[PDB]
């Protein structure tokens, strides 16, 4: 079913974002371009493994 | 029997949607555009008072060309409306596309206005 | 016409077995037809 996830700035490694997805719908690690406030710019933030 | 609405009726519905958000103040008045089959027109309008401050068209005498109602005509109007508006003391405007797609003639008028002083 | 989805529409010569040739718009350049409007037993009334 739908699960908690963490996205993490693929640059600095900063665990920047919790959210939710459906795993059956979305089974492969989702990625989004959301602001890292360590880097102070938009970066790709990927679901933590 | 096909029955069908006028393209203007269709446009007025689209223009309403534009005018929902966009509106002319005294500071930042509305550069409205009406194009037609034969001509193109431009009025700088202040909607709070409901007054056309400045205006320009292909029916004006400075614009002298047989091919009125093309892109080349629209650039000439876009110049004329802007320069006439600069005399009045209009700088900032909002471009009311008037239900027409921001493209070709309508865009040509806007681009010419941007080139010739007005800021949007 | 969008590029890439429409068959190339050409003028086609339709040749009937009765000897009648007529220009029709078609995707093929030549169309042989055994029975046309002029030789169909229905239209000839015989």
């Amino acid at each position: 079913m739908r699960v908690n996830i963490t996205l993490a700035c693929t640059e600095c490694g900063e665990r920047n974002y919790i959210s939710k997805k459906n795993k059956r719908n979305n089974p492969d690690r989702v990625e989004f371009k959301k602001y890292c406030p360590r880097d102070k710019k938009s970066t790709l933030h990927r679901e933590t493994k | 029997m096909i029955t069908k609405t006028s393209k203007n009726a269709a446009r007025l519905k689209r223009h309403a949607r534009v005018r929902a958000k966009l509106s002319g103040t005294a500071e930042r008045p509305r550069l409205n555009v009406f194009r037609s089959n034969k001509h193109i027109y431009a009025q700088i309008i202040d909607d709070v008072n409901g007054v056309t401050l400045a205006s320009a068209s292909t029916l004006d005498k400075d614009l002298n060309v047989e091919s009125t109602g093309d892109t080349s005509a629209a650039t000439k109007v876009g110049e004329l409306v802007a320069k006439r508006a600069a005399e009045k003391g209009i700088s900032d405007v909002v471009f009311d596309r008037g239900g027409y797609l921001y493209h070709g003639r309508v865009k040509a008028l806007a681009d010419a206005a941007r080139e010739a002083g007005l800021k949007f | 016409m969008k590029a890439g989805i429409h068959p190339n529409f050409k003028k086609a010569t339709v040749k009937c077995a009765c000897g009648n040739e007529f220009e029709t718009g078609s995707v093929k350049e030549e169309v042989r037809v055994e029975i046309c409007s002029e030789c169909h037993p229905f239209y000839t009334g015989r």
Binding site: - | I2 | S26, I35
Partner: protein, 178 residues
């Protein structure tokens, strides 16, 4: 196009005289022809749609739209949004080309052709024609056809009455049943 010239030179003056129209703009014309194939068996085979689209592409000279279901109907085992047929709209040049071919080539090849019904007008000058078999069209190769399929051809006019439309279509050369 031959029919388009015939319309302008012969048919339109003749209609103007017959119905005594005040202005040329009132004269009935063919606005569009819509061809329709209801592929309700697509519920069983997705590939049946692709076949029907291809066949209708050859006939019309123009890619059709795949028609999708508007609502779920359990009686037809149907779900909303499912592809269930094909529809194309012919206008301008291609309309007259298709109509000329329909009248002169395709309609004769109907097996036991008795003419087209005089009663298939809608009360508002539009004419609907049901074709039983796509094999009447010479563009359809008989060997490639997996299954015989009919189609509906709607001729939409600017006529206000069935009389005006029937006259227009008669003068175009539509082979009405005696």
């Amino acid at each position: 196009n031959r029919l388009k010239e015939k319309y302008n030179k012969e048919i339109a003056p003749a209609l103007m005289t017959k119905f005594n129209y005040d202005s040329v703009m009132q004269v009935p014309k063919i606005e569009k022809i819509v061809i329709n194939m209801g592929v309700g068996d697509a519920v069983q085979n997705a590939k049946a749609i692709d076949s029907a689209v291809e066949e209708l592409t050859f006939i019309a000279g123009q890619k059709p739209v795949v028609t999708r279901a508007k609502k779920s109907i359990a009686g037809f085992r149907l779900r909303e949004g499912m592809p269930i047929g094909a529809k194309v709209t012919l206008r301008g040049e291609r309309m007259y080309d298709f109509l000329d071919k329909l009248i002169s080539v395709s309609l004769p090849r109907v097996r036991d052709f008795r003419g087209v019904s005089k009663k298939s007008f809608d009360g508002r000058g539009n004419y609907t024609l049901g074709i039983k078999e796509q094999l009447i069209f010479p563009e359809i190769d008989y060997d490639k056809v997996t299954k015989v399929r009919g189609m509906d051809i709607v001729i939409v006019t600017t006529a206000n009455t069935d009389e005006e439309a029937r006259e227009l279509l008669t003068q175009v050369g539509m082979p009405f049943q005696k």
